[PDB]
Enzyme design. Sequence first.
Site, PDB file in Angstrom:
ATOM      1  N   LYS A 128      -2.949 -15.312  -0.587  1.00  0.00           N
ATOM      2  CA  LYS A 128      -1.781 -14.751   0.092  1.00  0.00           C
ATOM      3  C   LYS A 128      -1.983 -14.655   1.602  1.00  0.00           C
ATOM      4  CE  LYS A 128       1.228 -10.727   0.031  1.00  0.00           C
ATOM      5  NZ  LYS A 128       0.758  -9.767   1.042  1.00  0.00           N
ATOM      6  N   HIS A 160       2.821 -11.423   5.720  1.00  0.00           N
ATOM      7  CA  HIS A 160       2.614  -9.983   5.510  1.00  0.00           C
ATOM      8  C   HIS A 160       3.772  -9.220   6.126  1.00  0.00           C
ATOM      9  CE1 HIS A 160      -1.196  -7.459   4.676  1.00  0.00           C
ATOM     10  NE2 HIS A 160      -0.327  -6.518   5.058  1.00  0.00           N
ATOM     11  N   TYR A 205      -8.271  -6.785  -1.451  1.00  0.00           N
ATOM     12  CA  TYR A 205      -8.815  -6.853  -0.086  1.00  0.00           C
ATOM     13  C   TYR A 205     -10.317  -6.961  -0.283  1.00  0.00           C
ATOM     14  CZ  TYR A 205      -4.469  -5.808   2.426  1.00  0.00           C
ATOM     15  OH  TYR A 205      -3.241  -5.972   3.015  1.00  0.00           O
ATOM     16  N   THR A 254      -5.541 -11.438  -0.672  1.00  0.00           N
ATOM     17  CA  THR A 254      -4.858 -11.373   0.634  1.00  0.00           C
ATOM     18  C   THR A 254      -5.875 -11.673   1.703  1.00  0.00           C
ATOM     19  OG1 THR A 254      -3.282  -9.815  -0.162  1.00  0.00           O
ATOM     20  CG2 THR A 254      -3.496  -9.969   2.205  1.00  0.00           C
ATOM     21  N   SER A 284      -1.283  -3.202  -5.053  1.00  0.00           N
ATOM     22  CA  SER A 284      -2.126  -3.214  -3.839  1.00  0.00           C
ATOM     23  C   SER A 284      -3.475  -2.559  -4.154  1.00  0.00           C
ATOM     24  CB  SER A 284      -1.445  -2.506  -2.722  1.00  0.00           C
ATOM     25  OG  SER A 284      -2.328  -2.268  -1.633  1.00  0.00           O
ATOM     26  N   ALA A 327       0.848  -1.190   0.000  1.00  0.00           N
ATOM     27  CA  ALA A 327       0.000   0.000   0.000  1.00  0.00           C
ATOM     28  C   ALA A 327       0.884   1.241   0.000  1.00  0.00           C
ATOM     29  CB  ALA A 327      -0.857  -0.004   1.256  1.00  0.00           C
TER      30      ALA A 327
HETATM   31  C1  LIG Z   1       4.474  -0.876   4.064  1.00  0.00           C
HETATM   32  C2  LIG Z   1       3.797  -2.195   3.743  1.00  0.00           C
HETATM   33  C3  LIG Z   1       2.526  -2.212   3.229  1.00  0.00           C
HETATM   34  C4  LIG Z   1       1.910  -3.413   2.835  1.00  0.00           C
HETATM   35  N1  LIG Z   1       0.672  -3.365   2.236  1.00  0.00           N
HETATM   36  C5  LIG Z   1       0.178  -4.530   1.767  1.00  0.00           C
HETATM   37  C6  LIG Z   1      -0.969  -4.518   1.005  1.00  0.00           C
HETATM   38  O1  LIG Z   1      -1.532  -3.465   0.655  1.00  0.00           O
HETATM   39  N2  LIG Z   1      -1.408  -5.712   0.477  1.00  0.00           N
HETATM   40  C7  LIG Z   1      -0.819  -6.905   0.775  1.00  0.00           C
HETATM   41  O2  LIG Z   1      -1.338  -7.952   0.284  1.00  0.00           O
HETATM   42  N3  LIG Z   1       0.288  -6.959   1.545  1.00  0.00           N
HETATM   43  C8  LIG Z   1       0.779  -5.805   1.973  1.00  0.00           C
HETATM   44  N4  LIG Z   1       1.958  -5.802   2.669  1.00  0.00           N
HETATM   45  C9  LIG Z   1       2.664  -7.090   2.796  1.00  0.00           C
HETATM   46  C10 LIG Z   1       3.614  -7.350   1.588  1.00  0.00           C
HETATM   47  O3  LIG Z   1       2.874  -7.754   0.437  1.00  0.00           O
HETATM   48  C11 LIG Z   1       4.681  -8.405   1.854  1.00  0.00           C
HETATM   49  O4  LIG Z   1       4.044  -9.652   2.280  1.00  0.00           O
HETATM   50  C12 LIG Z   1       5.760  -8.005   2.827  1.00  0.00           C
HETATM   51  O5  LIG Z   1       6.253  -6.702   2.482  1.00  0.00           O
HETATM   52  C13 LIG Z   1       6.918  -8.972   2.811  1.00  0.00           C
HETATM   53  O6  LIG Z   1       7.766  -8.785   3.946  1.00  0.00           O
HETATM   54  P1  LIG Z   1       9.192  -7.999   3.759  1.00  0.00           P
HETATM   55  O7  LIG Z   1       8.873  -6.712   2.952  1.00  0.00           O
HETATM   56  O8  LIG Z   1       9.659  -7.709   5.164  1.00  0.00           O
HETATM   57  O9  LIG Z   1      10.138  -8.958   3.038  1.00  0.00           O
HETATM   58  C14 LIG Z   1       2.592  -4.615   3.040  1.00  0.00           C
HETATM   59  C15 LIG Z   1       3.862  -4.573   3.623  1.00  0.00           C
HETATM   60  C16 LIG Z   1       4.489  -3.371   3.894  1.00  0.00           C
HETATM   61  C17 LIG Z   1       5.907  -3.349   4.401  1.00  0.00           C
END
Ligand SMILES: Cc1cc2nc3c(=O)[nH]c(=O)nc-3n(C[C@H](O)[C@H](O)[C@H](O)COP(=O)(O)O)c2cc1C
Lengths: 368, 368
Positions: free
Chosen positions: B235, B259, B140, B166, B116, B89
């Site tokens: 996911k 996540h 979502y 997700t 996202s 996001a």
């Molecule tokens: C700032 C941030 C925002 C995230 N927003 C979403 C999101 O909108 N949708 C989603 O499916 N996962 C979201 N995630 C999870 C990521 O898809 C992903 O699983 C995660 O960044 C992986 O961990 P890592 O970045 O520490 O390797 C987000 C993660 C972060 C760091």
Amino acid sequence: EYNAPSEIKYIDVVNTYDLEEEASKVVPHGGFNYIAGASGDEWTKRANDRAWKHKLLYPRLAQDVEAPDTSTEILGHKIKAPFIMAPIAAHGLAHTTKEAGTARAVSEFGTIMSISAYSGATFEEISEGLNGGPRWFQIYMAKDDQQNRDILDEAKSDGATAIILTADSTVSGNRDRDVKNKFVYPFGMPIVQRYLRGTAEGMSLNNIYGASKQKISPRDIEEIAAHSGLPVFVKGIQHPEDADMAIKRGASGIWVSNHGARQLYEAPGSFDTLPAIAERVNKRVPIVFDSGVRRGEHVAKALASGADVVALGRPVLFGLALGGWQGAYSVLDYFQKDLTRVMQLTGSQNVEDLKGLDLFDNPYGYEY
Amino acid sequence: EYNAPSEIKYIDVVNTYDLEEEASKVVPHGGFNYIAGASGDEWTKRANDRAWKHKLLYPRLAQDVEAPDTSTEILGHKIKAPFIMAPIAAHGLAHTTKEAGTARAVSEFGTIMSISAYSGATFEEISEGLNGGPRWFQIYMAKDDQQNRDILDEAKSDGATAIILTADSTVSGNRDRDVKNKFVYPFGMPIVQRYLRGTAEGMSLNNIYGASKQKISPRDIEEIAAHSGLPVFVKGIQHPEDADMAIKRGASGIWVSNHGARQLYEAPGSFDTLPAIAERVNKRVPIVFDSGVRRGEHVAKALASGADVVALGRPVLFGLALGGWQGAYSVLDYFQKDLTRVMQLTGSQNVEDLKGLDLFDNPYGYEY
Ligand SMILES: Cc1cc2nc3c(=O)[nH]c(=O)nc-3n(C[C@H](O)[C@H](O)[C@H](O)COP(=O)(O)O)c2cc1C
Ligand SMILES: Cc1cc2nc3c(=O)[nH]c(=O)nc-3n(C[C@H](O)[C@H](O)[C@H](O)COP(=O)(O)O)c2cc1C
């Protein structure tokens, strides 16, 4: 000199174990013991069988399943059930219709026929039984490169869509039954006659294997794949390192097998080796599993453990002995129906679901 | 009122860990702690990182390898290296060019962009960065089925070739940094312009999760599949039973994730969960792995353990982090070069070879 059974009939299969004793009543003693026997005192053939009790199926309830679908696909072939025919030499030891009878059963049922390089039937005779059905050719390699090019070319011209390199028989296993019976083939092998100088009739398996290539290397896997332009399985793998090697040398499939315990003695039961090989393969190429499949539960357990399909051997040949193509067909039909029951009771609607099953670890083994 | 960095430059990436401390001296405290932080005291984010020490790579010698090839294919996309961009996001918290900047990096590098549902950029802004590059859309789910229909329709019109459902975020994780910072998004979510009935500026983080579907069931997986006519990844999976459930409910892929440790606290490090899931999936559908990938060695260990690709998250965003600014195309290039080294030292000519690596089990864990 050799009076094989010739009757053609459907048979009522209660279980495949009972086919061995029944076939022993109709197949000449030497041929029967060639088919049934295994290395040493047969401890590793018993291990192939008892290994199925090491990992046990769970019944699963309220799974919303009805009329399971046994169909699957391998290397562009849709097949009726996740089993194929293993390459087996000299079907004329079991029945006068020989490989043509087996081929007709396999094509009528709807799966893949593996043709042994040590067939007693010509490609023309097998092709008549197959009536267009899919076939894979199992090479016992010549020592001479040109003879391998000619064998491969004949197989592909006959319509082969894969090559099986059997590499676990560079020398014979210690098959005590065949030693005691002084077993020799009572007919020729037209596909490999070219490298026997003289005819396979009256020869021992030791001396035919002796004519085939001993010094198989990874280069052979590369050179078969390059020449055929067909996917190559490497058959006889029991150690994960050989799977990794075969794939890196250009194999398109791993065929986990100990040759029905006919080769190395005092080795593990084939099913016990499958998980470590599947984990090392890690989806890179399809896996065929054989050596000891006797029940639908065994097909399910192989799939749950990483095999894409299994190959069927002795039970199909015993079926051929007892009923020609209709007897062999009866065995394939038994396996499909047997698997269907097991799918319903395990909560499996389709073959992919079987791949997802968890198995119960039985550390007590056979005696429990 | 949010002053994200805007400078565009390549960065010399020595390692991705240093990118976190690097960036903030415009790079706002609340947004940085939103990106960097995780649930509770972050013990499970530390577990994501320390899990890589549980399974260690062996150097492999005289392996006949040079110029490894990092390229692979997933759902018929050929990509330059076995990593994709995770759906994250609000990229405008990291950089003024927001998701369009990330998309341009991903497209120019040659892999897949995950969008996202909570993007601060419109599809048209992202599309401009992508310049025809492949994209997957992350949803979502909505309580309101019409909102599910509408977003699936926009994603497919946008050119999505997969949907990422997700499912691990039905409520927010206990992200203490964001609570202590009283963090609220400083800009809207144009893609979810339909749902928030009220304001997309005046809905902090709990209320946006709130408007989404808590009561996701297997039917949700089937319904996304039937509506989209696209492959669906589920996911957030950490337990093998959910992988089996998802596949039986019509998922086309399993996305192993916690996540980034932003959801359930006092849970395993994501890499520790991967083998049990890969064994249960047993090749049925592709696996994406994420949560803690920081090094080429991590990509290799994920592949060796059953992932087809990994997804990259925080390191790519480090568009913003603490000291001086770093995370983008340079980060993707870092990962490709870092993986190339590891392939050379492990005897791996290509990505398939990485899937066959045996790992050393370290029972002592991080302190050794
Ligand atoms: C700032 C941030 C925002 C995230 N927003 C979403 C999101 O909108 N949708 C989603 O499916 N996962 C979201 N995630 C999870 C990521 O898809 C992903 O699983 C995660 O960044 C992986 O961990 P890592 O970045 O520490 O390797 C987000 C993660 C972060 C760091
Ligand atoms: C009578 C007999 C002959 C065989 N001949 C061959 C052969 O020509 N080529 C080959 O690759 N394997 C050969 N095998 C091994 C089979 O392909 C297969 O691995 C074995 O039958 C599986 O064990 P099972 O039948 O006990 O389940 C033979 C096996 C039997 C029983």
